[PDB]
Amino acid sequence: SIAQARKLVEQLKMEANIDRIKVSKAAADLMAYCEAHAKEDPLLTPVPASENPFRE
Amino acid sequence: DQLRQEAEQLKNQIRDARKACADATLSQITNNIDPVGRIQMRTRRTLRGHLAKIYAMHWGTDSRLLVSASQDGKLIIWDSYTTNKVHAIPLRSSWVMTCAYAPSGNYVACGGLDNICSIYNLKTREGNVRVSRELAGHTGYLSCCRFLDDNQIVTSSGDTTCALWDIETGQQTTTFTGHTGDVMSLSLAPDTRLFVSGACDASAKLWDVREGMCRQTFTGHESDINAICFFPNGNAFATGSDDATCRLFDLRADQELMTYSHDNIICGITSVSFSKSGRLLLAGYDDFNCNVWDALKADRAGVLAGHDNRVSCLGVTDDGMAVATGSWDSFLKIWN
Amino acid sequence: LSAEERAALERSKAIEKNLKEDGISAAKDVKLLLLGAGESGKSTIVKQMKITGIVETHFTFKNLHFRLFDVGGQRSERKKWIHCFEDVTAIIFCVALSGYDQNRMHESLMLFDSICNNKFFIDTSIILFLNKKDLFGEKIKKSPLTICFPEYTGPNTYEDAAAYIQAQFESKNRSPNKEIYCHMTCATDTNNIQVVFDAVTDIIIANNLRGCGLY
Amino acid sequence: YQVITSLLLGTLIFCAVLGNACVVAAIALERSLQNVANYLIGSLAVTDLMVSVLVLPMAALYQVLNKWTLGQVTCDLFIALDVLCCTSSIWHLCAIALDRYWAITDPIDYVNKRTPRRAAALISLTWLIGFLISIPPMLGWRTPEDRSDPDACTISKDHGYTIYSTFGAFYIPLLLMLVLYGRIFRAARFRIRKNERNAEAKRKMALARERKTVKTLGIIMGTFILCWLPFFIVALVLPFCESSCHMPTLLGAIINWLGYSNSLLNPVIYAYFNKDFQNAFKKII
Numbered sequence: 088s089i090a091q092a093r094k095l096v097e098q099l100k101m102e103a104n105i106d107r108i109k110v111s112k113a114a115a116d117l118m119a120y121c122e123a124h125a126k127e128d129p130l131l132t133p134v135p136a137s138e139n140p141f142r143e
Numbered sequence: 144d145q146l147r148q149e150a151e152q153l154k155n156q157i158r159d160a161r162k163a164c165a166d167a168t169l170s171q172i173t174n175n176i177d178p179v180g181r182i183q184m185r186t187r188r189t190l191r192g193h194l195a196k197i198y199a200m201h202w203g204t205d206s207r208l209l210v211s212a213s214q215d216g217k218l219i220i221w222d223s224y225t226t227n228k229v230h231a232i233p234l235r236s237s238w239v240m241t242c243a244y245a246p247s248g249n250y251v252a253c254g255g256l257d258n259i260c261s262i263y264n265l266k267t268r269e270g271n272v273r274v275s276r277e278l279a280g281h282t283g284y285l286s287c288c289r290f291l292d293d294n295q296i297v298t299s300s301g302d303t304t305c306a307l308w309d310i311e312t313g314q315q316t317t318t319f320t321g322h323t324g325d326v327m328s329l330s331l332a333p334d335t336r337l338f339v340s341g342a343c344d345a346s347a348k349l350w351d352v353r354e355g356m357c358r359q360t361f362t363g364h365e366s367d368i369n370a371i372c373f374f375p376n377g378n379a380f381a382t383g384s385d386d387a388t389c390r391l392f393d394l395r396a397d398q399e400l401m402t403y404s405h406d407n408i409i410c411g412i413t414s415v416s417f418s419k420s421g422r423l424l425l426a427g428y429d430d431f432n433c434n435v436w437d438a439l440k441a442d443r444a445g446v447l448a449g450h451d452n453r454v455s456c457l458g459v460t461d462d463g464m465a466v467a468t469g470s471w472d473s474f475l476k477i478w479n
Numbered sequence: 480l481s482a483e484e485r486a487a488l489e490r491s492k493a494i495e496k497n498l499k500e501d502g503i504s505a506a507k508d509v510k511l512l513l514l515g516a517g518e519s520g521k522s523t524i525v526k527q528m529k530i531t532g533i534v535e536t537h538f539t540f541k542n543l544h545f546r547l548f549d550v551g552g553q554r555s556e557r558k559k560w561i562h563c564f565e566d567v568t569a570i571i572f573c574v575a576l577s578g579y580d581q582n583r584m585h586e587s588l589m590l591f592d593s594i595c596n597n598k599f600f601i602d603t604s605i606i607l608f609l610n611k612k613d614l615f616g617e618k619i620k621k622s623p624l625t626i627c628f629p630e631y632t633g634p635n636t637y638e639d640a641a642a643y644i645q646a647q648f649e650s651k652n653r654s655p656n657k658e659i660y661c662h663m664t665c666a667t668d669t670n671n672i673q674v675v676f677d678a679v680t681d682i683i684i685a686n687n688l689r690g691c692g693l694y
Numbered sequence: 695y696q697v698i699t700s701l702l703l704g705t706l707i708f709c710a711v712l713g714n715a716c717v718v719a720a721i722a723l724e725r726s727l728q729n730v731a732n733y734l735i736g737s738l739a740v741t742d743l744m745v746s747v748l749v750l751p752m753a754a755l756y757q758v759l760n761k762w763t764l765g766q767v768t769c770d771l772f773i774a775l776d777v778l779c780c781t782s783s784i785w786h787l788c789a790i791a792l793d794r795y796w797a798i799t800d801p802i803d804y805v806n807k808r809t810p811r812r813a814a815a816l817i818s819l820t821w822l823i824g825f826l827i828s829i830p831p832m833l834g835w836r837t838p839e840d841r842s843d844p845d846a847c848t849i850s851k852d853h854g855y856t857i858y859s860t861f862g863a864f865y866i867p868l869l870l871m872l873v874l875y876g877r878i879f880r881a882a883r884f885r886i887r888k889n890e891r892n893a894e895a896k897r898k899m900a901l902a903r904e905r906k907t908v909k910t911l912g913i914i915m916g917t918f919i920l921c922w923l924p925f926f927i928v929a930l931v932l933p934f935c936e937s938s939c940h941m942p943t944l945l946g947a948i949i950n951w952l953g954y955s956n957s958l959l960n961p962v963i964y965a966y967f968n969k970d971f972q973n974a975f976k977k978i979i
């Protein structure tokens with residue numbers, strides 16, 4: 088039981104001592120990837136029936 | 144001992160640290176974005192031939208071939224373009240819960256209530272599919288399996304552990320411990336150096352394949368997690384639970400970003416997946432339906448109704464052309 | 480109509496033919512789910528019908544194929560795999576009568592209530608098997624049943640005490656279209672596989688009567 | 695008068711063709727409804743659709759105009775097409791009884807021997823007997839003076855053909871069904887009759903199940919007998935006792951159309967009442 092408790096403390100310590108960025112930057116980089124690749128999304132922008140392989 | 148109070152201290156420190164990093168909600172930053180609008184998708188193909196409930200599927204790397212596993216002890220490989228059947232592999236045990244496709248297209252895997260992951264050689268010199276390797280060592284039912292490459296595979300089971308195997312020898316090289324309950328899902332990163340797992344302890348964990356240690360732990364849900372999926376960027380992932388809600392977590396910010404819930408939905412989520420650009424979040428539900436979500440808005444943009452029973456599996460092609468949904472009524476459906 | 484694409488449709492038609500044949504013979508067998516405590520006497524019954532995940536045993540008895548699944552070796556959350564057996568014909572449950580003293584019986588009673596109230600098993604019939612009838616006899620001769628059940632009152636005898644426990648198990652059922660076929664296991668007779676055959680025959684007639692509208 | 699009669703008979707035809715067709719549709723669409731039981735119900739619905747589209751409209755014509763303005767050749771064709779489908783519809787009702795009887799009393803044959811080949815074999819014998827009943831009076835079995843009044847269209851009244859048609863179309867079917875559905879009743883009662891509050895709830899349920907078992911068999915047999923028996927007594931008595939047996943036209947028309955109404959009533963009894971068909975209909979609409 089003491090061994091298990093020690094393991095838990097050690098793990099939590101490792102997970103606590105990491106570097107975290109601000110949610111603002113994280114949210115901006117998600118929005119930026121989403122915006123940047125919007126032209127290559129067939130489900131987002133319906134594809135001409137000529138280029139659609141599951142109909143023609 | 145005093146270790147319980149030391150752990151409590153560290154828990155509280157972590158919560159305080161993440162609160163400091165929170166300065167603005169995803170919603171505020173993405174408010175200006177014009178809505179995506181209504182999405183109308185329509186069944187293009189319907190694949191028939193399974194005589195029992197379908198529990199899993201996985202697309203090929205060429206976006207044309209796919210594999211499905213069903214309770215009638217059959218592993219069928221389809222041709223979604225022409226609805227042709229390419230292979231039909233008979234399983235030794237009909238209690239199968241997961242299936243995979245190698246990134247090369249040379250192997251398939253399956254597993255289930257029998258605590259074994261079985262690998263099948265598709266393209267051989269005799270044209271007949273035979274079981275190449277059976278990997279044993281797990282104590283509970285096998286929940287998920289993903290091909291890391293043509294030689295390595297990552298599995299998760301109900302013994303609260305995940306493992307990395309070496310197919311050529313058959314012994315697990317690394318074991319990932321720390322989860323408290325059954326591990327139900329798994330998702331590999333695009334670079335295949337990290338992966339995430341969702342368990343019944345209502346927690347997701349990030350693992351390092353090479354080192355075999357837990358880097359980060361995410362806990363926002365209120366019940367067991369049934370599905371998990373990386374954002375295409377590789378810096379975020381989405382979770383689906385029995386709480387009838389989905390949640391998006393970010394690795395660098397190390398906290399939850401947005402929640403996808405509706406008061407009209409009370410059924411749990413079985414599977415989730417993203418689109419090619421990451422702008423759409425498709426989730427299967429127990430109310431016989433699949434709901435399209437706007438990942439940057441938390442607003443529904445369409446419904447893929449058409450299945451008579453519970454949608455158990457779901458997958459989007461590598462090139463993003465089509466989405467395939469399988470269900471308990473023994474029917475596959477490609478939507479596009 | 481290309482040569483290559485015709486070859487593909489031929490291979491597909493051959494595959495569809497074997498799938499149809501396998502599905503015909505896979506509906507002629509009776510599936511059963513074997514439940515109960517790890518130690519409740521399941522070993523003896525399994526032995527009678529064969530004279531670390533799911534153990535399967537199958538047998539033929541009077542032109543009827545039976546498929547028995549034992550899930551005793553699956554030590555996980557039951558809610559995460561119990562829906563795989565939604566379509567079993569009946570459930571076989573084993574209870575140790577002797578283990579009112581060693582309580583094992585309280586655990587068994589709790590398991591019985593859960594499986595008989597699952598949304599997936601609203602209409603599935605249960606074939607109860609009360610094992611170790613004789614050992615129970617010796618036990619109650621000395622130690623009274625009241626140690627397990629304070630509400631029990633009556634003469635401590637083999638007939639009275641056993642009938643009490645049977646009724647306590649039967650009470651849990653709160654549904655029509657569902658019957659509990661109890662049997663105190665006749666020692667090393669084939670009678671044990673004739674209580675499964677008679678119970679299975681009775682739950683096929685009742686299903687057919689419901690379809691016409693006569694039940 | 696012509697208007698009223700043409701409207702009421704027209705409504706009957708429209709309703710019959712509607713109902714019958716919806717049953718065939720539901721079976722073809724849904725995959726839940728594709729067992730051997732519903733292959734004998736769908737065949738009965740098809741046979742009663744054929745009755746409703748071919749025979750019923752031309753029988754309504756003859757009622758209104760009170761004359762057969764289509765010639766003698768057309769008369770003999772539509773008489774032979776009236777005896778075929780009506781006889782096929784009565785033997786379909788005994789094929790559903792023989793399937794139910796085999797299902798109830800032999801539960802191992804139900805498991806490992808019941809195939810659609812059986813459904814198909816039964817459907818073929820119903821139509822075979824129809825032809826064997828319908829074909830004789832074209833090739834023989836015809837009194838010389840029968841084809842007389844060019845303004846009438848009546849079946850042959852030969853004493854021998856009367857016995858043949860009546861006994862092979864209605865009387866043998868009736869007895870067969872009574873035997874089989876009495877045996878089914880006995881089997882059902884035997885199955886039904888094999889914590890004081892809990893015990894009383896069991897007794898209540900038993901009594902209610904011994905009432906549903908009588909209502910059902912009452913509905914079926916009462917519908918069949920009340921629809922077809924009055925016609926076939928008249929069709930057997932009149933040919934023999936020619937004189938002193940004048941048949942009122944109104945009562946004859948009533949019994950004839952009451953016999954036709956069984957094609958309307960069959961889909962209601964056999965299809966619209968069971969739960970699965972209702973669920974499929976709700977799913978479709």
Ligand SMILES: C/C=C\C/C=C\C/C=C/C/C=C/CCCC(=O)O[C@H](COC(=O)CCCCCCCCCCCCC)COP(=O)(O)O[C@H]1[C@H](O)[C@@H](O)[C@H](OP(=O)(O)O)[C@@H](O)[C@H]1O
Nearest residue numbers: 690691692709712713910913962963964965966967968969
């Ligand atoms: C004095 C004391 C006591 C006696 C007094 C009173 C009680 C009894 C009176 C006498 C009975 C008369 C007829 C009763 C019918 C009746 O109650 O019907 C019920 C109610 O459904 C609807 O109302 C809905 C049905 C809708 C039908 C379709 C309508 C349109 C038809 C035209 C078709 C063209 C347009 C679509 C449903 O059926 P049910 O209660 O009669 O019970 C059974 C039925 O008898 C079995 O036949 C049937 O088996 P099946 O043979 O496979 O079909 C069973 O599944 C079950 O339904």
Ligand SMILES: CC(C)CCC[C@@H](C)[C@H]1CC[C@H]2[C@@H]3CC=C4C[C@@H](O)CC[C@]4(C)[C@H]3CC[C@]12C
Nearest residue numbers: 905908909910911912913914916917920921959
């Ligand atoms: C248009 C024509 C064909 C309608 C025919 C009506 C039929 C179906 C009616 C007339 C008399 C009825 C029966 C009268 C008496 C009883 C007893 C009761 O405890 C159960 C219902 C039962 C057995 C009825 C069943 C339905 C019945 C047979």
Ligand SMILES: CC(C)CCC[C@@H](C)[C@H]1CC[C@H]2[C@@H]3CC=C4C[C@@H](O)CC[C@]4(C)[C@H]3CC[C@]12C
Nearest residue numbers: 699702703706757944947948951952955958959
């Ligand atoms: C099954 C349920 C809906 C009842 C069916 C009632 C049927 C048999 C009724 C409805 C309208 C009726 C018709 C109305 C008008 C006439 C004219 C009269 O000279 C009797 C014959 C005839 C042509 C009737 C025959 C019987 C008839 C067709």
Ligand SMILES: O=C1CC2(CCCC2)CC(=O)N1CCCCN1CCN(c2ncccn2)CC1
Nearest residue numbers: 752753756772776777780847848849859863950
């Ligand atoms: O005779 C004619 C002529 C027509 C038929 C269509 C065009 C002209 C008009 C018409 O109403 N009838 C039939 C009278 C109604 C009674 N039917 C019932 C079915 N039949 C039958 N079935 C089995 C055994 C014996 N007979 C024939 C008699």
